[PDB]
Amino acid sequence: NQRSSLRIRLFNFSLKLLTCLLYIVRVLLDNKINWSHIFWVDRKLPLWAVQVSIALISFLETML
Amino acid sequence: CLVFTGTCGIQHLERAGEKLSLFKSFYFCIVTFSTVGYGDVTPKIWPSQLLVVIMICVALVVLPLQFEELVYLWMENYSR
Amino acid sequence: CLVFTGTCGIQHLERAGEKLSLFKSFYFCIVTFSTVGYGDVTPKIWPSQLLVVIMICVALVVLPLQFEELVYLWMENYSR
Numbered sequence: 001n002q003r004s005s006l007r008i009r010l011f012n013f014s015l016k017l018l019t020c021l022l023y024i025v026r027v028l029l030d031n032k033i034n035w036s037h038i039f040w041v042d043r044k045l046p047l048w049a050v051q052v053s054i055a056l057i058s059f060l061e062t063m064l
Numbered sequence: 065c066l067v068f069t070g071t072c073g074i075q076h077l078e079r080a081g082e083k084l085s086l087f088k089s090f091y092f093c094i095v096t097f098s099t100v101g102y103g104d105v106t107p108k109i110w111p112s113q114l115l116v117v118i119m120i121c122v123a124l125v126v127l128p129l130q131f132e133e134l135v136y137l138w139m140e141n142y143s144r
Numbered sequence: 145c146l147v148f149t150g151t152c153g154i155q156h157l158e159r160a161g162e163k164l165s166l167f168k169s170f171y172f173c174i175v176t177f178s179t180v181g182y183g184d185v186t187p188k189i190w191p192s193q194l195l196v197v198i199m200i201c202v203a204l205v206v207l208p209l210q211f212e213e214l215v216y217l218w219m220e221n222y223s224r
Contacts, residue, residue: 020068027075027086033110034080041076091193098200101181135212 012061015054022047066126067093070119077112097123146206147173150199157192177203 026044070093071086078084084092084105092105096119107116150173151166158164164172164185172185176199187196
């Protein structure tokens with residue numbers, strides 16, 4: 001299809017916009033070679049939950 | 065897209081040594097791909113240098129291939 | 145024309161932090177578009193960086209299009 005194929009790519013496109021733009025906000029709030037600050041990083045819980053839901057949709061889009 | 069990836073990784077690594085902001089990192093990243101080389105803001109960490117080298121290496125792969133593909137089309141009507 | 149615009153805005157912004165002259169700013173501006181990257185004179189302010197990035201971004205738009213348009217004519221008589 002031409003119409004329906006354009007919508008699923010728009011959904012997968014605009015989903016991946018949100019995850020990148022949500023990553024900007026959590027960086028703005030969080031604040032020897034320290035690997036403490038590199039990996040163990042207190043990401044926000046409400047902004048984490050939206051990133052997981054987008055990940056589950058895009059994981060299922062690859063499965064389909 | 066490559067500009068955003070550099071600003072993420074460098075700033076995230078820079079939390080260990082000299083806390084740069086997104087504003088200060090975006091200045092540094094777009095400078096490195098434009099090839100000015102200010103070096104006023106710099107990576108002062110073992111993995112931060114390791115990334116910034118890879119950012120420049122990945123930039124050397126991308127930039128010349130995109131400019132050549134643009135001029136390929138540029139070489140070769142009435143509107144509504 | 146783009147050289148004058150950079151020297152205006154940067155020097156005007158630099159009155160807030162480290163007062164540069166027109167002589168010192170013209171050195172910095174023509175260095176950034178030639179792509180040497182000295183960084184001895186630098187922008188040390190929130191909007192000064194924001195401009196200098198846009199100066200380099202606007203330079204990336206202009207410079208390659210002007211060089212390509214020059215070589216386009218250069219590829220293709222007796223005086224009075």
